């Protein structure tokens, strides 16, 4: 596709399908791993871990 | 007819925005009209599945 967040979709469904298992630290407390990836859409939201 | 109701005409002095408002009325002034939309929330924000 000719999305530039491909990739980070490609991380965040895995975290989605993971979370309870391993846990990931994120940037802030509001938004929590279990973020669904559609959201993922813009930039902006692309992760520091 | 009263120039003191009708100050922004009669007065190239006085800025457009000056009202003398605790005493006369003025009848005419530059108002403001505006165009913003008030939609619903259920209609801007969506959710994911």
Same mark, same amino acid.
């Given at each position: 596709?000719?999305?530039?967040?491909?990739?980070?979709?490609?991380? #965040?469904?895995?975290?989605? #399908? #993971?979370?309870?298992?391993?846990?990931?630290? #994120?940037?802030? +407390?509001?938004?929590? +791993?279990?973020?669904?990836?559609?959201?993922?859409?813009?930039?902006?939201?692309?992760?520091?871990? | /007819?009263?120039?003191?109701?009708? $100050? /922004?005409?009669? $007065?190239?002095?006085?800025?457009?925005?000056? /009202?003398?408002?605790?005493?006369?009325?003025?009848?005419? $002034?530059?108002?403001?009209?505006?165009?913003?939309?008030?939609?619903? /929330?259920?209609?801007?924000?969506?959710?994911?599945?």
């Amino acid at each position: 596709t000719t999305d530039p967040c491909a990739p980070v979709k490609a991380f #965040m469904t895995l975290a989605n #399908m #993971m979370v309870g298992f391993e846990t990931i630290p #994120m940037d802030n +407390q509001i938004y929590t +791993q279990s973020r669904r990836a559609s959201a993922f859409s813009t930039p902006h939201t692309w992760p520091r871990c | /007819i009263p120039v003191e109701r009708y $100050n /922004i005409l009669t $007065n190239p002095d006085a800025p457009p925005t000056q /009202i003398q408002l605790p005493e006369v009325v003025d009848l005419y $002034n530059v108002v403001t009209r505006y165009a913003y939309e008030t939609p619903p /929330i259920t209609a801007v924000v969506m959710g994911v599945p």
